């Protein structure tokens, strides 16, 4: 349940570390279905809350996905990947857990047809941030 994790979230990061390491084991683009994509995003944001990371520290990376989202939608990716690395540099600590999910997705995206795979990548990255606030 998505609502059941909020009763337990409010050493506990280790029990969800197997869920994050399994999701980081699968790195192919569109390797999960539509319902399975959002089910991965619940496990990500619950893992990103036990060792909690604020959205601001991420906010520069979230800017570069969104300004491209207007440029992809009837209007490059290495500019976001260069920022996703450099923002993960000045950690302190849980920025590496967020880097282990972006950089497998962005290495496949690095060479990819632009119109489809980024618009499918953009739906997963919303639900990570979207669900992160639902738990805190």
């Amino acid at each position: 349940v998505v609502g059941i994790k909020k009763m337990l979230e409010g050493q506990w990061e280790a029990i969800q570390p197997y869920f994050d390491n399994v999701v980081r084991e699968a790195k192919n683009f569109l390797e999960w279905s539509p319902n399975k994509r959002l089910a991965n995003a619940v496990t990500v944001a619950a893992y990103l809350t036990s060792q909690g990371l604020k959205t601001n520290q991420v906010r520069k990376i979230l800017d570069m996905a969104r300004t491209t989202e207007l440029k992809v939608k009837r209007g490059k990716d290495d500019l976001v990947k260069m920022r996703y690395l450099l923002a993960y540099t000045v950690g302190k600590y849980s920025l590496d857990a967020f880097h282990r999910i972006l950089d497998p997705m962005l290495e496949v995206l690095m060479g990819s047809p632009k119109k489809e795979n980024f618009e499918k990548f953009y739906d997963f990255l919303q639900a990570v941030v979207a669900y992160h606030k639902f738990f805190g």
Binding site: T55, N56, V58, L62, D63, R66, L70, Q126, V129, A130
Partner: protein
């Protein structure tokens, strides 16, 4: 009674943010307090509601400071007393701020005939009960220029994330806040269209509209301008009177005021009779 059309005065120019502005509305990631944006292009504009509403506001306080002086020029300004109807919850108890909207009192004339004499409600309109005096101006929504749209293409920053803090005085603990702000220097194509309904007193409305603009260049434009977020500036591109014949024959022979590198204070004080001398010849 007797609505007539003589033509339109169209004012085109560039609103410039000398300091970064903020209008704002109540995306997933983003600043807590963002700025209004165009839903199709994602660029932050300036609405015509926010520009007309601030000009009507600043012109109403300009009347209450001089109700002794404006009363001899315009009838139906002796219908009331200076102040607001805020204590006595009455729609017409003899004050200038007579109509409440939901909780706040705004000067609105209640009848068509008293709105044709008020300087605030000739230019901006009334909507009383059984009355409905329509406005004589149209204030379009103000989008970015063709120059500052190319700056968004090249990667230059249009917006900004200004961070402010309110400090508790006794314990010195800080509460932080973030507010989206357009980068200072950005420019906006605005447009203001006055309908020449009466050739008697079109000249008073142009002086009253340009008076309110120079008040708005002294005050701010939306969103916490006591802290710096205003300092806005009108730069006039073109000034143009489209005569009624213009719409008949379609020819581009419609009379023009140069208005080049001239301020809102130059159009009223320096050369109002020199510039508008040729508009008067056609009317």
């Amino acid at each position: 009674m007797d609505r007539r059309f003589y033509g339109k005065i169209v004012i085109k120019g560039k609103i410039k943010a000398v300091t970064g502005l903020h209008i704002g509305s109540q995306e997933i990631g983003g600043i807590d307090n963002p700025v209004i944006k165009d839903p199709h292009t994602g660029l932050p504009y300036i609405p015509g509601s926010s520009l007309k509403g601030r000009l009507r506001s600043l012109f109403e306080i300009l009347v209450n400071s001089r109700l002794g002086e404006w009363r001899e020029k315009y009838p139906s300004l002796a219908n009331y007393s200076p102040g607001s109807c805020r204590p006595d919850n009455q729609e017409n108890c003899g004050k200038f701020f007579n109509r409440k909207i939901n909780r706040g009192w705004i000067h609105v004339c209640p009848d068509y005939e008293t709105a044709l004499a008020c300087p605030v409600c000739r230019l901006f309109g009334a909507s009383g009960k059984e009355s409905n005096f329509p406005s004589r101006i149209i204030v379009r929504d103000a989008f970015l220029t063709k120059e500052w749209e190319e700056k968004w293409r090249a990667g230059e920053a249009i917006t900004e994330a200004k961070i402010e803090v309110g400090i508790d005085r006794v314990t010195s603990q800080a509460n932080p806040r973030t507010n989206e702000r357009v980068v200072a220097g950005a420019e906006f194509e605005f447009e203001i269209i006055y309908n020449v309904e009466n050739t008697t007193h079109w000249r008073d409305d142009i002086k009253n509209l340009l008076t309110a603009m120079a008040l708005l260049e002294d005050s701010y434009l939306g969103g916490s301008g006591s802290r710096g977020y205003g300092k806005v500036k009108f730069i006039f591109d073109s000034f143009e009177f489209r005569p009624l014949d213009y719409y008949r024959t379609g020819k581009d022979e419609d009379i023009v005021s140069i208005d080049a590198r001239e301020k809102s204070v130059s159009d009223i004080l320096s050369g109002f009779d020199s510039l508008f001398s040729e508009v008067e010849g056609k009317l």
